[PDB]
Amino acid sequence: QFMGIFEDRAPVPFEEVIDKINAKGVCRSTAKYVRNNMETTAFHRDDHET
Amino acid sequence: RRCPTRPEGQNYTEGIAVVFKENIAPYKFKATMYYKDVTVSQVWFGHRYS
């Protein structure tokens, strides 16, 4: 049973835009962003950064 | 002088008309929505309060 689904939209940092997406065509698998005045990190698939 | 006469007169054709304009009003129909509101609430029961 689903007991809660926190869905948020995090921004993509600049250095992840120019260096990664615009240049290499890839995007990081971890979202690091400031939300509710705290620095939060979300690791995709509870795994390493990729 | 040989001055002019009355014009020929417009030959008018009697008839019935129906005037159609472009349809912008949406097609409407009665539908029926079957669904289930699932609300799961997590409560922390304190000493005096919830």
Side-chain angles (χ1 to χ4, degrees):
Chain A
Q1 177 174 3
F2 273 107
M3 291 299 201
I5 299 189
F6 168 47
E7 200 277 346
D8 199 12
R9 295 200 310 174
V12 177
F14 292 143
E15 66 264 10
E16 193 175 337
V17 165
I18 312 302
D19 293 356
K20 280 293 180 71
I21 292 181
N22 167 59
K24 292 191 198 89
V26 300
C27 185
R28 257 190 268 276
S29 76
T30 68
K32 198 162 148 56
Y33 64 114
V34 53
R35 165 75 64 227
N36 282 7
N37 308 344
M38 169 190 84
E39 187 72 29
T40 177
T41 75
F43 293 71
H44 180 54
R45 293 279 288 90
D46 311 354
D47 218 328
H48 283 311
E49 181 172 295
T50 316
Chain B
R1 319 202 180 95
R2 178 69 276 168
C3 54
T5 73
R6 293 182 183 174
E8 305 192 2
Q10 194 67 260
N11 284 300
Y12 272 115
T13 303
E14 280 160 8
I16 308 183
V18 186
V19 192
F20 301 81
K21 71 199 166 180
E22 175 198 332
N23 184 21
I24 63 198
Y27 167 71
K28 294 161 279 177
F29 64 100
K30 311 303 291 184
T32 319
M33 292 178 71
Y34 305 160
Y35 60 99
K36 299 199 189 167
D37 265 7
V38 173
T39 296
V40 60
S41 68
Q42 166 186 347
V43 186
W44 187 76
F45 305 106
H47 167 239
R48 179 54 39 66
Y49 64 96
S50 303

